[PDB]
Scaffold this active site. Sequence first.
Site, PDB file in Angstrom:
ATOM      1  N   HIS B  88       0.869  -1.202   0.000  1.00 54.68           N
ATOM      2  CA  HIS B  88       0.000   0.000   0.000  1.00 54.68           C
ATOM      3  C   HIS B  88       0.896   1.238   0.000  1.00 54.68           C
ATOM      4  O   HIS B  88       2.132   1.131   0.140  1.00 54.68           O
ATOM      5  CB  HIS B  88      -0.869   0.054   1.261  1.00 54.68           C
ATOM      6  CG  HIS B  88      -1.831  -1.082   1.394  1.00 54.68           C
ATOM      7  ND1 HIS B  88      -3.045  -1.090   0.763  1.00 54.68           N
ATOM      8  CD2 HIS B  88      -1.693  -2.271   2.058  1.00 54.68           C
ATOM      9  CE1 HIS B  88      -3.609  -2.243   1.032  1.00 54.68           C
ATOM     10  NE2 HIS B  88      -2.826  -2.995   1.829  1.00 54.68           N
ATOM     11  N   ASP B  91      -1.150   8.995  -1.131  1.00 59.24           N
ATOM     12  CA  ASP B  91      -1.039  10.161  -1.987  1.00 59.24           C
ATOM     13  C   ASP B  91      -1.917  11.212  -1.320  1.00 59.24           C
ATOM     14  O   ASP B  91      -3.085  11.002  -1.060  1.00 59.24           O
ATOM     15  CB  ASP B  91      -1.516   9.811  -3.425  1.00 59.24           C
ATOM     16  CG  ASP B  91      -2.056  11.031  -4.286  1.00 59.24           C
ATOM     17  OD1 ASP B  91      -2.047  12.262  -3.980  1.00 59.24           O
ATOM     18  OD2 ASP B  91      -2.546  10.717  -5.394  1.00 59.24           O
ATOM     19  N   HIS B  93      -3.480  14.828  -1.629  1.00 62.12           N
ATOM     20  CA  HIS B  93      -3.832  15.891  -2.590  1.00 62.12           C
ATOM     21  C   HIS B  93      -3.355  17.267  -2.068  1.00 62.12           C
ATOM     22  O   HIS B  93      -3.278  18.210  -2.851  1.00 62.12           O
ATOM     23  CB  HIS B  93      -5.355  15.946  -2.840  1.00 62.12           C
ATOM     24  CG  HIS B  93      -5.883  14.837  -3.705  1.00 62.12           C
ATOM     25  ND1 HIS B  93      -7.168  14.841  -4.232  1.00 62.12           N
ATOM     26  CD2 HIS B  93      -5.285  13.668  -4.111  1.00 62.12           C
ATOM     27  CE1 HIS B  93      -7.316  13.685  -4.931  1.00 62.12           C
ATOM     28  NE2 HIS B  93      -6.212  12.933  -4.895  1.00 62.12           N
ATOM     29  N   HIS B 128      -5.452   9.352  -0.399  1.00 62.37           N
ATOM     30  CA  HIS B 128      -5.875   8.002  -0.687  1.00 62.37           C
ATOM     31  C   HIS B 128      -4.671   7.145  -1.065  1.00 62.37           C
ATOM     32  O   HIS B 128      -3.583   7.662  -1.425  1.00 62.37           O
ATOM     33  CB  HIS B 128      -6.990   7.955  -1.804  1.00 62.37           C
ATOM     34  CG  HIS B 128      -6.548   8.523  -3.135  1.00 62.37           C
ATOM     35  ND1 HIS B 128      -5.805   7.829  -4.073  1.00 62.37           N
ATOM     36  CD2 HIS B 128      -6.764   9.754  -3.683  1.00 62.37           C
ATOM     37  CE1 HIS B 128      -5.605   8.658  -5.137  1.00 62.37           C
ATOM     38  NE2 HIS B 128      -6.173   9.845  -4.955  1.00 62.37           N
ATOM     39  N   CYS B 129      -4.853   5.838  -0.881  1.00 60.90           N
ATOM     40  CA  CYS B 129      -3.827   4.866  -1.261  1.00 60.90           C
ATOM     41  C   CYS B 129      -3.816   4.835  -2.851  1.00 60.90           C
ATOM     42  O   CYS B 129      -4.867   5.033  -3.501  1.00 60.90           O
ATOM     43  CB  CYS B 129      -4.223   3.492  -0.649  1.00 60.90           C
ATOM     44  SG  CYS B 129      -3.167   2.168  -1.291  1.00 60.90           S
ATOM     45  N   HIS B 138      -7.831  -0.213  -4.512  1.00 63.24           N
ATOM     46  CA  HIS B 138      -7.615   0.187  -3.140  1.00 63.24           C
ATOM     47  C   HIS B 138      -8.515   1.354  -2.754  1.00 63.24           C
ATOM     48  O   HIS B 138      -9.036   1.361  -1.640  1.00 63.24           O
ATOM     49  CB  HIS B 138      -6.152   0.529  -2.885  1.00 63.24           C
ATOM     50  CG  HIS B 138      -5.215  -0.652  -2.986  1.00 63.24           C
ATOM     51  ND1 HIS B 138      -4.274  -0.887  -2.010  1.00 63.24           N
ATOM     52  CD2 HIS B 138      -5.155  -1.622  -3.928  1.00 63.24           C
ATOM     53  CE1 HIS B 138      -3.662  -2.013  -2.371  1.00 63.24           C
ATOM     54  NE2 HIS B 138      -4.158  -2.497  -3.515  1.00 63.24           N
ATOM     55  N   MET B 143      -9.990   2.720   0.992  1.00 64.13           N
ATOM     56  CA  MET B 143      -8.688   3.254   1.370  1.00 64.13           C
ATOM     57  C   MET B 143      -8.427   4.708   0.983  1.00 64.13           C
ATOM     58  O   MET B 143      -7.590   5.010   0.138  1.00 64.13           O
ATOM     59  CB  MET B 143      -7.586   2.296   0.889  1.00 64.13           C
ATOM     60  CG  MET B 143      -6.357   2.378   1.773  1.00 64.13           C
ATOM     61  SD  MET B 143      -5.216   1.013   1.632  1.00 64.13           S
ATOM     62  CE  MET B 143      -3.905   1.450   2.951  1.00 64.13           C
ATOM     63  N   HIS B 248     -26.942  17.390   0.836  1.00 71.20           N
ATOM     64  CA  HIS B 248     -28.074  18.236   1.137  1.00 71.20           C
ATOM     65  C   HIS B 248     -28.544  17.915   2.533  1.00 71.20           C
ATOM     66  O   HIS B 248     -28.667  16.762   2.922  1.00 71.20           O
ATOM     67  CB  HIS B 248     -29.187  17.982   0.149  1.00 71.20           C
ATOM     68  CG  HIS B 248     -30.479  18.636   0.518  1.00 71.20           C
ATOM     69  ND1 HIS B 248     -30.758  19.955   0.251  1.00 71.20           N
ATOM     70  CD2 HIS B 248     -31.584  18.145   1.127  1.00 71.20           C
ATOM     71  CE1 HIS B 248     -31.962  20.270   0.689  1.00 71.20           C
ATOM     72  NE2 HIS B 248     -32.484  19.176   1.221  1.00 71.20           N
ATOM     73  N   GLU B 272     -28.806  24.971  -1.272  1.00 74.97           N
ATOM     74  CA  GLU B 272     -29.788  23.939  -0.932  1.00 74.97           C
ATOM     75  C   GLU B 272     -29.062  22.618  -1.112  1.00 74.97           C
ATOM     76  O   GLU B 272     -29.053  21.813  -0.221  1.00 74.97           O
ATOM     77  CB  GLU B 272     -31.037  23.993  -1.801  1.00 74.97           C
ATOM     78  CG  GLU B 272     -30.876  23.742  -3.304  1.00 74.97           C
ATOM     79  CD  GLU B 272     -32.173  24.035  -4.124  1.00 74.97           C
ATOM     80  OE1 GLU B 272     -33.291  23.461  -3.770  1.00 74.97           O
ATOM     81  OE2 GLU B 272     -32.063  24.794  -5.130  1.00 74.97           O
ATOM     82  N   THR B 273     -28.307  22.512  -2.191  1.00 75.89           N
ATOM     83  CA  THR B 273     -27.539  21.309  -2.530  1.00 75.89           C
ATOM     84  C   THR B 273     -26.273  21.813  -3.259  1.00 75.89           C
ATOM     85  O   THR B 273     -26.319  22.894  -3.843  1.00 75.89           O
ATOM     86  CB  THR B 273     -28.391  20.341  -3.431  1.00 75.89           C
ATOM     87  OG1 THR B 273     -29.616  20.032  -2.728  1.00 75.89           O
ATOM     88  CG2 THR B 273     -27.605  19.003  -3.762  1.00 75.89           C
ATOM     89  N   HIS B 299     -28.100  13.963  -2.632  1.00 76.84           N
ATOM     90  CA  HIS B 299     -29.385  14.239  -3.258  1.00 76.84           C
ATOM     91  C   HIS B 299     -29.780  13.494  -4.552  1.00 76.84           C
ATOM     92  O   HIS B 299     -30.722  13.874  -5.227  1.00 76.84           O
ATOM     93  CB  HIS B 299     -29.808  15.723  -3.199  1.00 76.84           C
ATOM     94  CG  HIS B 299     -31.288  15.940  -3.004  1.00 76.84           C
ATOM     95  ND1 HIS B 299     -32.237  15.615  -3.955  1.00 76.84           N
ATOM     96  CD2 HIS B 299     -31.986  16.527  -1.977  1.00 76.84           C
ATOM     97  CE1 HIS B 299     -33.449  15.992  -3.552  1.00 76.84           C
ATOM     98  NE2 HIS B 299     -33.310  16.550  -2.350  1.00 76.84           N
TER      99      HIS B 299
END
Lengths: 333, 333, 333
Positions: B88, B91, B93, B128-129, B138, B143, B248, B272-273, B299
Amino acid sequence: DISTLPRVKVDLVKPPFVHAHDQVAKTGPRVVEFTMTIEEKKLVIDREGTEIHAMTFNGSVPGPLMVVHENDYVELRLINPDTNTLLHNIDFHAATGALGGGALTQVNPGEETTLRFKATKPGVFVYHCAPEGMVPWHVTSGMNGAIMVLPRDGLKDEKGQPLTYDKIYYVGEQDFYVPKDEAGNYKKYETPGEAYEDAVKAMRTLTPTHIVFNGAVGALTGDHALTAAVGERVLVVHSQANRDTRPHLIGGHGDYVWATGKFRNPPDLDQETWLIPGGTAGAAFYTFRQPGVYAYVNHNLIEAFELGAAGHFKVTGEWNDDLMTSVVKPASM
Amino acid sequence: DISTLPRVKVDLVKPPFVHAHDQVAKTGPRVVEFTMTIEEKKLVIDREGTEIHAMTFNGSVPGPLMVVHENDYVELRLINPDTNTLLHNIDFHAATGALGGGALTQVNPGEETTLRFKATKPGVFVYHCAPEGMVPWHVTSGMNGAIMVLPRDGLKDEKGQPLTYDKIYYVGEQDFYVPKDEAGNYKKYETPGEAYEDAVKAMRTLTPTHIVFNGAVGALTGDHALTAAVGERVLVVHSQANRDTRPHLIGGHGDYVWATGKFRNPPDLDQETWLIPGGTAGAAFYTFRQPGVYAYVNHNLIEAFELGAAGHFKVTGEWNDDLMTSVVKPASM
Amino acid sequence: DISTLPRVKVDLVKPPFVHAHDQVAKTGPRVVEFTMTIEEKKLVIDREGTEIHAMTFNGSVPGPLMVVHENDYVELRLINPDTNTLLHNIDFHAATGALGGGALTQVNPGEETTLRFKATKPGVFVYHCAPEGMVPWHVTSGMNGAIMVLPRDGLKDEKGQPLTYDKIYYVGEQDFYVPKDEAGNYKKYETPGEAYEDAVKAMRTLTPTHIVFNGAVGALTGDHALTAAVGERVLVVHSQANRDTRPHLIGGHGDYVWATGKFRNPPDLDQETWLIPGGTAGAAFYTFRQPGVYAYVNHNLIEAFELGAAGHFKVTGEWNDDLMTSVVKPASM
Ligand SMILES: [Cu+2]
Ligand SMILES: [Cu+2]
Ligand SMILES: [Cu+2]
Ligand SMILES: [Cu+2]
Ligand SMILES: [Cu+2]
Ligand SMILES: [Cu+2]
């Protein structure tokens, strides 16, 4: 009025490269002339040899990127040689009226036409073929590209200060719907027309079989990776004429991003991933700070790694340990 | 330079809770130390007992939320115990270079590594892996998690005035692709590796079988509903590492929302969303004004009510009839 | 306090038209009264005669558009006549508390209720039926609409200057999931209840069979196209209660667009296409500059041209050759 305008002919280049242009306009408005030739052709899209009948503008998928400035007149000569089998046309999202120009540009094999339109709004836009009744079929067969209408004073940041790129690349993302037999093996056809009835059934499932950059799985990799150096400001234009995408530069960011690609709006800053809706062109600006390989991907990772939506950047320069460093290299507990 | 920085070790907490931190920084930049242990484990995801082999950071889906301030250095010790079966990595971001750190953190069962990176941009990001060649497998096995890089002066509204939350919750949304037999019954495997070949075929359909919050259908409900009181300002961080979502709050709003989660940008008001693209973390700020149950949902209601993407908020306080009141209770015409 | 407020009853109109209202408020806050009657009915959705049991507010899909001003009180009388077979309710996204009003408005066939709520935030919002346990079924059966809460000083541009529309149209977009037999032929049912068990299986595939505007394929075309004249400023409100959409006016633009539809935020300018997330109402403002037909479409073109998400605008006036002209009409090389 137009009679009196200066005119410049421009010869297009194949994606991901972009024809020569000035970011800041040094001349007043002009009539910019382009010529595109339609080419229906077989194209292999993956490693296993899957073949399709691509419908193209100038022979590439995506079609080439056109670059003009706000208020220039775009004059396009569109030729459909007699070797093609189908009627085609062109709808520019940057244009006002006549279905983006689609209603004025219908050419059967053997015909040509010349359309002129004023580029009144700045931004990157999609252009695509759109014949009445077979619109999704020509678009998803690779018949789309994009045009960039730059402000006469070039790009600007969130504060009105100038942004100048050193390099520009055009990534056209394409969703393909290849018919399959009962076992899942892809079908092959003799002519574009033979594929039609099966093409329509494949599209209605709404599940692409391939999603690729520059027309094929692995097109922007290896000896074809995009290039840059630590310190270069790079503008990446990305378009999706039919389906939503979410670009992401792995190991980087979008320092300034116009997701829906319209330059009168201020950019969004520091994006990790951004959404470009189907039917739109977006642009992200980034300055490289670390050397090495970067993966440019559609962040639905199944679409990226299983379906083909992944490209590479190969960047030169010195590593900066302040930004990132391996304190302890992988080793056994 | 780094040698001289103060260091603080932080012990993580299980989602939806978040480890202790200061919104406004009271100290200068520091090196923030975290330790995560990878755990491959069977996990039941629904009421009928569907079981999968989850790949986790610290034993939960999603992995825990890390919280630092802009310009701090994040120092992570990542351990892959010998009881796991797979290689594994991680990473981020939020990081710059080496594939988000993925290329520097590959650990087989029995190894560990320590990566350091500077958090140069404020916002919430996904981590995330991402092992070469098995990336979507993964990520969709659970993951992934998120890290929040707070501005040293905390959050601010559309006008530069301060926003202070009283409570913070982390909702990690996960799309699962469980293999099925010919009748539609879900399959079960002995080891993660046995599931692999079938996992890949299931993912290519692009249709999740489950979409859940906090790793299971109904994880944030009943005795597990999120809690608040009328008058509390609540920040809800939401992440989707692979697929788009549209959160939402039923009976509420997102008073201030950073949909793509980057704090240098002004928030959008009164949502609202909102759309969080796959591969992104977003944050919404809301002040409760009415007591009762609230449903927090993705939603697309089929994804929410049939597939599992629904959680609850249980809020205490007095009802305000000015805002809403039943003039005539349901009764027979 | 409310006792003392002036009251006005408003009679609703069928989409795509909108009931009479003032953009800028000429009176102070009031209690705006509306009455809606639920109607369960068979509806033909396509050319081949596919029929479904629609669940509607006032007999149309979408339900009618309500228009009020910020800080007015909306008072709704909701009737469920004894001729219906199912329990229904209503959740307003514009409201605060009690699940958007859903928990206070449950009416079985033969009952009625009256709910009042204060419209505290300006923007266009979705309203939809949401009975406990059968939420996606009522929404995707056409049981949703939208309400527009206008600022008391009307609309404003990116700079705080006024925007006044001459015409307003409401386009409700609907995703339908019609059960199919083994060959792909659509099923028909005697009562809404008979369709239920099959409706749920169809929804879980997450692939709509139809996506239409105003309840049917071709509803906004031909003699039903929307109308305008060159020079008119038109506001188009668009809603999607369950699924994402990307509207685009072919041959036009969205001069000012609130994609997530909340008026306290500045609009985005010059959009070619914009994303409205499922569970949201958006509004775009455009001034016509060229006469002719325009296609208004969801820009996933397969959803537009194969599934039904396409409408028309028929615009009168004089053509402007400065903006667009055919230099050379299609002719043989
Ligand atoms: Cu074509
Ligand atoms: Cu188009
Ligand atoms: Cu892993
Ligand atoms: Cu990633
Ligand atoms: Cu209902
Ligand atoms: Cu809702």
